[PDB]
Every structure is written in C-alpha cells, then in structure tokens.
C-alpha cells in the first residue's frame, strides 16, 4: 500500500536533490537531471516505499520482479526520476523491524500506477482456504528482514519515485527562474511556464474564455499564449 | 452563352483541375501534420526533447526523430516528383 503525494501549485528546486548527492541511485528517464530546473511540468506525483537493495533494479520501466509485477509496476511511457538511498540506521532496531511488508502471491499482475488495498490470502486452484492458510494457500502479507547485523547487499534502501507529465495545462510546478518583463513587437526568444517558442509577440484580438490557456491554428501549432502574471492574450508568429 | 451559365452553376468543370489542386494541398497538409507524430520518440516537439535530455541521450532521440523526419520528407519529395511529372505531361499536352 504505497504512499503517493501530489505536489503542485508551488516552486520546487531540484538542484538540492541533484546537488546534495547523498542518494545511492538517481536514475532519470526522459529528463536530464542537470536540465530539470529549466523544464517546467504539471501534475507531479511522489512515490513512497522501502525495498531491499537487490530489488532496486526491478523498480524501473520495462523490468521484471516479484514486487514490480505484483506490488507496483511502472508504466512503459514513464517520464519520471526515481531516487534511492540507504537508511540502515533508521531501519535497525534492537527489537527489530517488521512493519514493512511485500506481497508474495497474487492471481493476476498488478496494473501500472495502481495499488492493491485488498487484504486477502492468495488462493491457488483447488482446496480453497477460506482463511485456512495451510499448505498451498498463502496469506497476503509478508514481512522483511532488515537487521543491523544483516549485510549491506540486502540491507534496506529508501526509494522515492518522482513522476511528472508535461504540456497539458498551465503549469505551476515551474522552476527557479526569476521572471522578466514582457517584450512586444520584436523578434525574441520566450518561455512561458515551461513552454518554449520563439516568435513576434503582439496584442491578440482573439478573446479567450477563462478555462483556456493556449490557442492553436489548423496545423496544431502554437498560435496564442497568455502571460500568466499579466493576464493578457498575445499572438505568436515566426519572426522571419 | 451556355458555357458561361454552365461555369457559374457548378464546380464540376474545375474538378479535373481542382482535384489536382486539392490533392496537392492534402499531401502538404499531411506532411505538415506529420510534425506532430512522435515516431517512437519521447516527445514530438523537437525543442522540448533537447531541453529535457542530456547530450548522449538527446543524441539518440534526435537520431530517431531525424530518421522518422527524414522518412517523412522523402515521401513528400518522392510524392511531389510523381505529381510534378504528371503535371509536366499535362503542360506538354497543356502546352500542346
């Protein structure tokens, strides 16, 4: 039952994450880690869970593992970055820790970006358990073995998955940049909320309804944009 | 007099000619739209891909786009030549 948080309507700096470099693994798909700030995105999601170091490879696009195919499966088109880093000290207790669990058995493969909240013991074929849980019938939960004495190789890793989708709606998940005053009637490079295009900017006659944030022509190319701070509507054309 | 009336009353006279006009317009439009298609790439817009990808990765995706985009262009040029040749024959006939 992985924890998911939706982060939006705010400004995040990824330099500290990239900059800090206190994490064992910082794999990035479809996004340059260094280039993260410049790009702007909407509907960012956060994934929380802890799995052993050996299975860290399994939590990636187009990979196979018991947990990946039975607990949490990343989509093929994922454009997110996943960060891993050990917290051995936190996972070592004198009493021992076993509140962390992973599923062993399930009848069918878990869907991508979905969590199975159902609590049941997996049943295989005949001699149905109905809570009997003897031989060939297995309870859904399975605990972990994180111990201080236990080796680093199988020691706990803390894994966070960062997933984002871009160019759908106006984006508030924008990065670090200090904005600049708008320039009109002069061919200049421009970026609006993580959207980049270059053309002449002029006051636009076209009237936009409150919900809309973009305009397009017959060829589905950007034709108009609204400066978020200003509230105005303008027409973009190639300079020359 | 009749011919004047016939011409004003219908688009059928220019259908043989117009088909050529429409067919050329449609071919150009498809190719232009092609730009939108991903062609196996992460994202269709060229700048977007470059902005969010580091050079080596960006290299691969760029290559993919070019191959997809090269093919699109090839079809247009190849398509255009056949039509050009067809139009050329008419002009000779046209010129004749």
């Amino acid at each position: 039952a992985w924890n998911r948080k939706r982060i939006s309507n705010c400004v995040a700096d990824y330099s500290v994450l990239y900059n800090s470099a206190s994490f064992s693994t910082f794999k990035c798909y479809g996004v340059s880690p260094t280039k993260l700030n410049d790009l702007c995105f909407t509907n960012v999601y956060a994934d929380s869970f802890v799995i052993r170091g050996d299975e860290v490879r399994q939590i990636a696009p187009g990979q196979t593992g018991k947990i990946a195919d039975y607990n949490y499966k990343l989509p093929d088109d994922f454009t997110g970055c996943v960060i891993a880093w050990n917290s051995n000290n936190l996972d070592s207790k004198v009493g021992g820790n076993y509140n962390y669990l992973y599923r062993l058995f399930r009848k069918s493969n878990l869907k991508p970006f979905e969590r199975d909240i159902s609590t049941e013991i997996y049943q295989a074929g005949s001699t149905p358990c109905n809570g009997v849980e003897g031989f060939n019938c297995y309870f859904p939960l399975q605990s972990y073995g994180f111990q201080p004495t236990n080796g680093v190789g199988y020691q706990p890793y803390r894994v966070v998955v960062l997933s984002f989708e871009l160019l759908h709606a106006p984006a508030t998940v924008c990065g670090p940049k200090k904005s600049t005053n708008l320039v009109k009637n002069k061919c200049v490079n421009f970026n609006f909320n993580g959207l980049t295009g270059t053309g002449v900017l002029t006051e636009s006659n076209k009237k936009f309804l409150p919900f809309q944030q973009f305009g397009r022509d017959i060829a589905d190319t950007t034709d108009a944009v609204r400066d978020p701070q200003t509230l105005e509507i303008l027409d973009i054309t190639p300079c020359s | 007099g009749k011919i004047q009336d016939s011409l004003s009353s219908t688009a059928s006279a220019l259908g043989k000619l117009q088909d050529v006009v429409n067919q050329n317009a449609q071919a150009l439009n498809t190719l232009v739209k092609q730009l939108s298609s991903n062609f196996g790439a992460i994202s269709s817009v060229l700048n977007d891909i470059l902005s969010r990808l580091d050079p080596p990765e960006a290299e691969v995706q760029i290559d993919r786009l070019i191959t997809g985009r090269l093919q699109s262009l090839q079809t247009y040029v190849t398509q255009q030549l056949i039509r050009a040749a067809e139009i050329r024959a008419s002009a000779n006939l046209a010129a004749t």
Binding site: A219, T221, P238, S240 | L28, V32, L35
Partner: peptide, 30 residues
C-alpha cells in the same frame, strides 16, 4: 514561413498569364 515551409512566388503572375492567353486568342481571331 508558416513552419519552415515556404511557398515561392510563381515566376509569372496571374495577370501576366492572362495577357499571354489574351494574346493567343487575339491573334487567332485577327
């Protein structure tokens, strides 16, 4: 200039083409 595709102007204008056509027609009758 629409999106990197440019439609060059015709070498002969529509008006110029009409004169050639008019000339041939004029020549035929006279």
């Amino acid at each position: 200039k629409f999106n990197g595709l440019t439609v060059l102007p015709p070498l002969l204008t529509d008006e110029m083409i009409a004169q050639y056509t008019s000339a041939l027609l004029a020549g035929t009758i006279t």
